[PDB]
Design a binder for these strands. Structure first.
Lengths: 77, 56
RNA sequence: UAAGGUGAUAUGAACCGUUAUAACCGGCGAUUUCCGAAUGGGGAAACCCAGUGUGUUUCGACACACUAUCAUUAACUGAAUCCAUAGGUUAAUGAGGCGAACCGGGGGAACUGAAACAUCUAAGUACCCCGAGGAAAAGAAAUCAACCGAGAUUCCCCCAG
RNA sequence: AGGGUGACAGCCCCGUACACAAAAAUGCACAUGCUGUGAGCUCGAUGAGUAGGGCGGGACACGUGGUAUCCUGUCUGAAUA
RNA sequence: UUUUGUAUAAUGGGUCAGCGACUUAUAUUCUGUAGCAAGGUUAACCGAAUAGGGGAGCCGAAGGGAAACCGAGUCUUAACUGGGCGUUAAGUUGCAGGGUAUAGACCCGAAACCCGGUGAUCUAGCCAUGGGCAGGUUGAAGGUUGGGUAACACUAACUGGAGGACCGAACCGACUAAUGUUGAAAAAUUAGCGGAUGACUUGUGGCUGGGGGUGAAAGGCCAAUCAAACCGGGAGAUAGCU
RNA sequence: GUUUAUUAAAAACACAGCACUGUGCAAACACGAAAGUGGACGUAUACGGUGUGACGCCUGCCCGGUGCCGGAAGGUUAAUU
RNA sequence: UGAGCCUUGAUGGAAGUGUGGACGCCAGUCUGCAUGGCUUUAAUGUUUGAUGUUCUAACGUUGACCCGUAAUCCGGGUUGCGGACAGUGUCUGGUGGGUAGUUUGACUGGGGCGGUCU
RNA sequence: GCUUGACUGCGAGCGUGACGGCGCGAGCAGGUGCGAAAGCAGGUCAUAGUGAUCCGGUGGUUCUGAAUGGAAGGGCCAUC
């Protein structure tokens, strides 16, 4: 499930569009990566499957806060 | 990525100065390895209140 | 409620009943095999095979009840790694499947029309998928107006082919 | 109104108009108890990887147009009455 | 019925009964008719419900100009002797009808295109595990032994028992003919025929699913069909043809 | 040997043999949006693709065209800036 | 290592016994080396891009081991090998009958070929 | 020889087309050339020498211009 654990980003659909303007179904999908984040608050490595962006979100908000959600929302981690 | 420093740390370090550091270096080494911290503003005071309650 | 009654093809038999337990109607309860979500395990549905606790002046064995999975919670346990975490057992709640349309969402055609055809159309239709209610959805302005003023959402008639 | 009864029935039967009914289980209303639950005032606070932007798409009757508005896959990224 | 034309040897119909094709909705115009008339008329809704209320609004009484704008005129042009379009005819709302528009739009009919299911009980290929091949030939390697060589070579008997080896039943196929052809049979019967220890044959079960499979490759096979299976659906596809 | 089950059994397919070509192993290749898997529990005396088609004697010239292979100058050339 | 800024030596405590580099108006004199009672020049500190080594800490491991776990999945952990490569998202140029949707005129003494089309 | 009438605005009234359209035209207004003048000239003896609509470009023009003033874009005339 190409799905960003932090941000909710899943794949989306659109068209392609030639010069001839031809519509053809396509998919956009999240730049996902799954990373080993160091918590320390847990002295452990939680490894989330993330989108660069999710990563930025973590880099901002803060890991302990992100992990806050998910748990807050039932998710594993 | 900005972050303020704890320990010395080469080419920038200074026990608490205000450096601007490349994204990765930090979320990958500087921290989750104690040596700096996200300049979360809540911090730029948290670690400036020292530069006042101390160096003056 | 009652003087008639034991559904029908479908008689007959043997019976029930007439002033209140015949029958008949309705409220509430009892019982409710097996299969089926099917949930002890299995399985070519309605069959096969268990385990655990029980129970028998005949306490072998054969009856009765529990034992699926998943989630939340708790208790008891408990690794690599000593603390922790993971893991494991148990217990209590809950879910599960079914089924009209209407509803919200994920995805989404082609014939066809353009008197061919690719932009365009058919259409966000058909269809598949998930979810929910009695309705759903939406909703109390970073809305409109236009220098006057309106004051959420929904629905209808005009505006206007 | 209607239906039936040996042919077409207001008065033969069942009904209809009308007026009546529940030991029970339930629905909705109110009035009350229970557990909750928070009410009013004063002083505050006022939604950031967000708005905006590049790219690619999508939605707006609007087919990138001179094209506002909205959503966002990708890269970025403010002000703070 | 179609045709320039059909007794026509061109189409359709064995016959009778029943059924079977220009419809409905909303728009829009015209005609007929009715009402009111420089006006006609209400929609939603309200309702005392076919009344009444509601005149939002629509159409009409004013055009010209792309427009600003002007206005019974106006536009053209610097302006037109002028030119064009206008001013001189009554609308409007029901009701019935004739056309059109959107809708399956008079009825029936494709070959197809798209979506979602069902199918390897027929067949193709593969996997697992099992079964089957009467009878009769040929007689490879190798081996023993004699003869033979300086020793090998070589040679004779024997022994052995290979092979998509031979002949031929079962089994598997299907080259020719005849019959049959409203069949005994939706692919056979009868006489002949190729293989028959193998790239053999066959039972049970399993796997591969539709632009997909499988194919010793014919476009072959995938349940009597296959240059794209069957079923349901889009669906009354479309048919300028009959 | 195979084949057009049902008008074609052949000179068509196949075959051992041969050649070219790709592949250093998490191979190439192939089913698959992926995970997973075949190749292969193999490893260049192997695996795939293509052609030829026992065997004998043999397989000449042509690299312009098309296809493919190699080329660390120059010209031309995308997003981006 | 291309270019900017900061600077300490160039254009804008005396005289004599002694030195590397040179557009030196063509024949100088210097720019420094020793001593002796805002614009044309060399290296530092830098700031900023390019190239190159190596590191480890993202990330890969279809090497070995530990545990969950009597397990050829998975997860965690340790170790080894790689390593900011590879790979993957977004954008972009090329290739791309593998797949797709289609087009491929009429006239015509039948059609096609030829011819013709205002 | 002198010139730019290969002029601008229009146009009674004809032709010829299903239509889109094409064609001929004296005359009026402004302005111009030639000629002493009467006068002739809105191309070429005539009849071929061509391409609708869309979209877009260029010049001109306040006609329009989504709160207002502007602007963008649209219209109109010329033209590609």
């Amino acid at each position: 499930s190409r799905v960003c654990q932090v941000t909710g980003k899943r794949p989306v659909t659109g068209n392609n569009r030639s010069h001839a303007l031809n519509a053809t179904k396509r998919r956009f999908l999240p730049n996902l990566h799954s990373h080993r984040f160091w918590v320390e608050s847990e002295k452990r490595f939680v490894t989330l499957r993330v989108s660069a962006k999710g990563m930025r979100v973590i880099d901002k908000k803060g890991i302990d806060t992100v992990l806050a959600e998910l748990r807050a929302r039932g998710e594993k981690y | 990525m900005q972050v303020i420093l704890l320990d010395k740390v080469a080419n920038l370090g200074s026990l608490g100065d205000q450096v601007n550091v490349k994204a990765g270096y930090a979320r990958n080494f500087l921290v989750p390895q104690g040596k700096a911290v996200p300049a979360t503003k809540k911090n730029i005071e948290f670690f400036e209140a020292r530069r006042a309650e101390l160096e003056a």
